[PDB]
Amino acid sequence: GVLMDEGAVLTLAADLSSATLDISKQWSNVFNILRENDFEPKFLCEVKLAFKCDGEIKTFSDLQSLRKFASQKSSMKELLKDVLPQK
Amino acid sequence: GVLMDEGAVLTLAADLSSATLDISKQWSNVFNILRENDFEPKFLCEVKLAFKCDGEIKTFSDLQSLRKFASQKSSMKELLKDVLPQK
């Protein structure tokens, strides 16, 4: 597509505690046929946080990496001091 | 951990149409602080189908690749003929 593929963007609940994924009926059917014929299918999910920092898109999967990156920027270091781990 | 990391395994709805993701309260807080301070945060999601085939774990993100792989195996070719695209 025209836009840069970054993967599926999650729509969070009001309380930002959960998000719901909708599966393509075609992939649901593929899943059921595989399940019924003993292939033990599973849908695997990989989630990352992304945001626009200086002029770039930064992505993170673990808070220690986010902490290391934010430590380098005055625009973030004090902001996330109370959320991020003290390790 | 002790088990092989394959990413998060989705728990599908009875009708296999949807699945719900639960977000870590710590990452929810990181998200809200970033949102409020104009970082335009988003959680990006990448989903793959995985199953045990002969003795391996095969993963797929597009049906044409699944069709090409299943075409090679008699154990799958006729099974998915009606689900997978005819391309």
UniProtKB/Swiss-Prot annotation, chains A, B:
Q: Which gene encodes it?
A: L1TD1
The protein, known as: LINE-1 type transposase domain-containing protein 1
Q: Which family does it belong to?
A: Belongs to the transposase 22 family.
Disulfide feature: none
